[PDB]
Scaffold this active site. Structure first.
Site, short mmCIF file in Angstrom:
data_model
loop_
_atom_site.label_atom_id
_atom_site.label_comp_id
_atom_site.label_asym_id
_atom_site.label_seq_id
_atom_site.Cartn_x
_atom_site.Cartn_y
_atom_site.Cartn_z
CG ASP A 278 -6.57 5.45 -1.03
OD1 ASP A 278 -7.72 5.58 -0.71
OD2 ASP A 278 -6.10 4.77 -2.13
CD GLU B 215 -3.25 -0.73 0.01
OE1 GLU B 215 -3.15 0.30 -0.46
OE2 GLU B 215 -4.05 -1.63 -0.42
CB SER C 60 -11.93 9.32 -2.06
OG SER C 60 -11.56 8.26 -2.81
CG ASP D 33 -13.51 8.32 -5.41
OD1 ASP D 33 -12.59 8.67 -5.31
OD2 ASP D 33 -14.15 7.31 -4.65
CG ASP E 159 -17.07 -2.27 6.91
OD1 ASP E 159 -18.00 -2.04 7.55
OD2 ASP E 159 -16.72 -1.93 5.65
CG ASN F 139 -8.58 6.88 -4.73
OD1 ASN F 139 -8.90 7.04 -3.66
ND2 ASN F 139 -7.65 6.02 -5.15
CG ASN G 234 -11.34 5.92 0.17
OD1 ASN G 234 -12.48 6.49 0.17
ND2 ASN G 234 -10.45 6.43 -0.88
#
Ligand code: CL
Ligand code: CL
Ligand code: CL
Ligand code: CL
Ligand code: CL
Ligand code: PT
Ligand code: PT
Length: 129
Positions: free
Chosen positions: A52, A35, A50, A48, A101, A46, A59
């Site tokens: 990280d 990562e 967003s 979109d 989650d 990203n 995120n």
């Protein structure tokens, strides 16, 4: 800060990630490697909109607030900048929430594509833990 492999393993162990939700420590170290390359200050934007953040590339759409991700949920209740600290506490605490989650570690695309199904124990070999 850029961690060493064994240094990060030791810190992760201390903060309770070894076997958290069934995921052995090697899984976590492997995820961090691919990562962020063990760099607490890593950020990636990203498509979109967003971003990280940090060693586990958490995120902004869901987990932290960066002030620029419209409809962010901030489920970890922290500024995203807290995830870039050389102290990994906030990252670890938030990762524990993410992995509980439903999707487990498949939430981390690099874990899914690069660590899942591999000999993840190699990531802790040689370390004093
Ligand atoms: Cl702790
Ligand atoms: Cl703790
Ligand atoms: Cl730490
Ligand atoms: Cl520490
Ligand atoms: Cl912690
Ligand atoms: Pt620590
Ligand atoms: Pt901790």
């Amino acid at each position: 800060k850029v961690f060493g492999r064994c240094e990060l393993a030791a810190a992760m162990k201390r903060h309770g990630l070894d076997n958290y939700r069934g995921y052995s420590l090697g899984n976590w170290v492997c995820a961090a490697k691919f990562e962020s390359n063990f760099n607490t200050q890593a950020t990636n934007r990203n498509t979109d909109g967003s971003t990280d953040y940090g060693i586990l590339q958490i995120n902004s759409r869901w987990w932290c607030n960066d002030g620029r991700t419209p409809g962010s949920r901030n489920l970890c209740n922290i500024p995203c900048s807290a995830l870039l600290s050389s102290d990994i506490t906030a990252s670890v605490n938030c990762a524990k929430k993410i992995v509980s989650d439903g999707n487990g570690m498949n939430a981390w695309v690099a874990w899914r594509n690069r660590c899942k199904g591999t000999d993840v124990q190699a990531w802790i070999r040689g370390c004093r833990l």
